[PDB]
């Protein structure tokens, strides 16, 4: 249930962008730096285009892996044709974690108001791999990381958190 | 529409879904590989995975997204128990279902093996212009599917129409 100690988790980070490469992947860099600073282990990282098959390929590999416990995705949750992260990912879930999108939208409403409507953040679990998909904006990633994700990936957080139920290595 | 005068090879990946069988035991996958090669197609990849939806999704997703794989042939895991996961793995990955494959296969199978046909759930779909055909683990079932359904539809010469015009173009 609740650990006396912090327990590093193994995290993979996906950026979904048509144009950004590693050089200007500001949100992916933020997430990687923030995860490492908190003491987690970023075991893999990729950037893919706004393509549902590319996303499914990379996320399916991490879902099936022995080592990846958490997947963070940034980008592709918007409302236009090319935004495909929810379309890609929802079919891969065993269960949806409805609380992630809801709390994210609640906290975002406070920070950016009605613009919260323009994103479709979503989370789920597949093969005991937690999948968290958030907007491409670094500001959004910060809100999600600081206020939702980091707390829930800390095995000490009360009354409960993800740790006990993440995929065991092996 | 669209019929070719010449045979045009397709690029095929073959998946066997089995807990126990390794390559030496893999009669159906060998059958599909050999039949595809004999017909002139190129088998560009082959894998064996356990009866695990995630392993199936990882491999089939890689092939869907690939530049080269136009057709995925899967054998195994279409039965009616808890451990058979091929349809459950695959259906969520499809853009569209190819309803005629399962239906024609079941017609042919009922004639061949009778009511035992009910014990399998053959299914096909397309994803990213990649044709995915999932058939039972038995070699007899693979022969019936290949000879009477799949080979003709993968032959660009087949009238009145076939898959060729619409499979994923190479880069």
Curated annotation (Swiss-Prot), chain A:
Keywords: GTP-binding, Molybdenum cofactor biosynthesis, Nucleotide-binding
Amino acids binding GTP: 108
InterPro entries in UniProt: MoaB, MoaB/Mog-like_dom_sf, MoaB/Mog_dom, MoaB_proteobac, MoCF_biosynth_CS
Pfam name, any one: MoCF_biosynth
GO process terms (BP): Mo-molybdopterin cofactor biosynthetic process
PROSITE patterns: MOCF_BIOSYNTHESIS_1
Protein name as it appears in the record: Molybdenum cofactor biosynthesis protein B
Gene from which this protein is expressed: moaB
């Amino acid at each position: 249930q609740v650990s006396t100690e912090f327990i590093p988790t193994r995290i993979a980070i996906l950026t979904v962008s048509n144009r950004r490469g590693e050089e200007d992947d500001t949100s992916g860099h933020y997430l990687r730096d923030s995860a490492q600073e908190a003491g987690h282990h970023v075991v893999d990282k990729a950037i893919v285009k706004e393509n549902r098959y590319a996303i499914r390929a990379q996320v399916s590999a991490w879902i099936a892996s022995d080592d990846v416990q958490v997947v963070l995705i940034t980008g592709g949750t918007g409302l236009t044709e090319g935004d495909q992260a929810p379309e890609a990912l929802l079919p891969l879930f065993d269960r949806e974690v409805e609380g992630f999108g809801e709390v994210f939208r609640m906290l975002s409403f406070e920070e950016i108001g009605t613009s919260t409507l323009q994103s479709r953040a979503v989370a789920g679990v597949a093969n005991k791999t937690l999948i968290l998909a958030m907007p491409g904006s670094t500001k959004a990633c910060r809100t999600a990381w600081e206020n939702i994700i980091a707390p829930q990936l800390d095995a000490r957080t009360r009354p409960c958190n993800f740790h006990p139920h993440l995929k065991k290595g092996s």
